[PDB]
């Protein structure tokens, strides 16, 4: 818990944890239709861990575009769902598994460590 | 809605209208395993649309067993839980997908008939 490292008036204590990697804690399915996606911006202003990423740019004769991709970053997404609601064209596919899958896909943390 | 029909005096309308199956309003896993199954019934008689069906059967002695298969009808299954729930030796594996994947599984009900 670390409490003693804090505590200790000389800083005698070193405590270390590996705490587990977020994708282990949540589960669930997302996908992005690129092709229906108009790249508005507003489910990478919206997602609330920045696990949306869109490669923005000024357009050219070119590349009449104002961005060239978009993805989602799974080790960060939490399927909290704020994306799929806003997305005005519903290119968002997106469903959390925690509760019907959650026994089998979330293994229980074990939470390691020394202290010296 | 048919209140016309209901209406009329001189029972001069006729309104048909098809409504979807009940499969498809519903989603879900259900799987029983005839090993672990010791044919109780206690699924059968809670089942609330009667989707469990089992192959009683007196037993001799060539055949000493009270039940020889045990099923469930898919097309009646609405995924409750109750039978997993009361069953004595956990031979149930049955998972809802309703409010998780209801969005993209459950097709929106659409009503088609006519008149006359
Ligand atoms: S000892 Fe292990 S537990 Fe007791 S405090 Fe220091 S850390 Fe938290
Ligand atoms: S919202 Fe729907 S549309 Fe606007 S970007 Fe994220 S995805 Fe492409
Ligand atoms: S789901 Fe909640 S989290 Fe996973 S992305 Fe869409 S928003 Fe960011
Ligand atoms: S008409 Fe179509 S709607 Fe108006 S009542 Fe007879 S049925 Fe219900
Ligand atoms: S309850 Fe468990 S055991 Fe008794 S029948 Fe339904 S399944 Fe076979
Ligand atoms: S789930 Fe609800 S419905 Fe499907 S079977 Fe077990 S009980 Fe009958
Ligand atoms: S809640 Fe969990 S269980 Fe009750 S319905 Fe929506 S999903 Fe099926
Ligand atoms: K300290
Ligand atoms: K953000
Ligand atoms: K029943």
């Given at each position: 818990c670390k409490a003693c490292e804090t505590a200790c008036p000389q800083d005698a204590i070193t405590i270390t944890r590996e705490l587990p990697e977020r994708k282990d804690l949540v589960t669930g399915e997302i996908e992005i239709d690129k092709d229906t996606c108009?790249?508005?911006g507003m489910c990478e202003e919206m997602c609330p861990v920045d696990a949306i990423e869109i490669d923005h740019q000024t357009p050219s004769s070119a590349s009449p575009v104002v961005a060239t991709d978009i993805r989602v970053d799974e080790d960060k997404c939490?399927?909290?769902?704020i994306c799929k609601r806003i997305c005005p064209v519903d290119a968002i596919m997106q469903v959390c598994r925690i509760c019907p899958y959650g026994e089998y896909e979330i293994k229980t943390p074990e939470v390691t460590g020394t202290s010296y």
């Open positions: 108009i790249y508005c939490v399927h909290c769902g």
